[PDB]
């Protein structure tokens, strides 16, 4: 069934005015709240 969700509108003008890139905004939101797979590392000999 449908469920409540949290709609956030980015204001393009305000952001343009303040000089904040939309890409910095979406990465910041997405990385913080959704998580971001950056790259790999080696844990006890295995790529993870």
């Amino acid at each position: 069934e449908d469920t409540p969700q949290f709609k956030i509108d980015i204001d393009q003008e305000k952001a343009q005015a303040l000089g904040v890139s939309i890409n910095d905004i979406n990465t910041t939101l997405g990385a913080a709240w959704g998580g971001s797979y950056v790259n790999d590392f080696i844990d006890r000999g295995r790529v993870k």
Binding site: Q12, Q16, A17
Partner: protein, 48 residues
């Protein structure tokens, strides 16, 4: 919608005046390409 594309914000002028996409372009639904045109007995058609 064409309306939403039309109001895409391209920039804000020195004097708060705004430039939207519809101010530099015509916006409409149209074919991915316009190279093929068919007729059925002289009348406008499409087909598979």
């Amino acid at each position: 919608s064409t309306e939403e594309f039309g109001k895409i914000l391209l920039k804000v002028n020195q004097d708060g005046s705004r430039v939207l996409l519809r101010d530099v372009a015509k916006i409409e639904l149209g074919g991915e390409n316009y190279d093929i045109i068919a007729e059925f007995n002289g009348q406008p058609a499409s087909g598979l």
